[PDB]
């Protein structure tokens, strides 16, 4: 659905931390409370306005870390044309 994939991708870019990527990668012994707690996609969106670029290097591994984006990652590998 168009409305389902819109709200799923909007909340993913506004509520994502580096600790989620360390869970699927079995990284529980090297977790920082000052750099992993900050949002990674927020700093990437802020740098695009300052630099003036128009391409975002979205990582597909970050969609599998979030439990709310499980169905969104499967739909991207199926038909990414839409």
């Amino acid at each position: 659905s168009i409305q389902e994939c819109t709200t799923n991708f909007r909340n993913f870019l506004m509520s994502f931390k580096y600790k989620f990527r360390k869970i699927l990668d079995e990284r529980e012994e090297f977790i920082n409370n000052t750099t992993d707690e900050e949002l990674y996609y927020i700093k990437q969106l802020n740098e695009m306005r300052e630099l003036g670029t128009s391409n975002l290097n979205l990582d597909a591994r970050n969609l599998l870390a979030y439990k709310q984006t499980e169905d969104l990652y499967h739909q991207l590998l199926n038909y990414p044309q839409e």
């Binding site: 169905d71 499967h74 739909q75 199926n78 038909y79």
Partner: protein
């Protein structure tokens, strides 16, 4: 178009031969609907054993061995038609994540059925 058009009365009747294919097929058919096997290998040894059981009962059946050996290209469309007409229901539950190709075909079939139902109610 009326100078060399003969009507060769061939002894291979396709109307009566289609009924014998449905009776022969009625384990391997249940694995196709469950998305587990995409190769229905029809062995010719099973057809030879099936003709021996029908010959002892007194039923005049056609030679299925010599019919396929003479023209097996036409048997690919006749054998596949009896499978689709006698395809059982899938036992395993169909999910919306496995095989994305079937999800588009299932959504297009329901969309085409709703358009035909709305067009019939508008005329009637």
């Amino acid at each position: 178009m009326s100078a060399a058009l003969p009507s060769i009365q061939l002894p291979v009747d396709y109307n009566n031969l289609f009924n014998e294919i449905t009776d022969f097929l009625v384990a391997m058919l249940q694995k196709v609907a469950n998305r587990e096997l995409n190769s229905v290998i029809i062995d010719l040894d099973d057809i030879l054993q099936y003709q021996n059981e029908k010959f002892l009962q007194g039923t005049q059946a056609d030679d299925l061995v010599s019919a396929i050996q003479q023209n097996a290209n036409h048997f690919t469309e006749l054998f596949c038609r009896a499978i689709d007409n006698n395809m059982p229901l899938p036992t395993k539950e169909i999910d919306y994540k496995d095989d994305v190709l079937d999800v588009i075909l299932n959504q297009r079939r329901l969309r085409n059925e709703r358009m035909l139902s709305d067009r019939t109610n508008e005329i009637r």
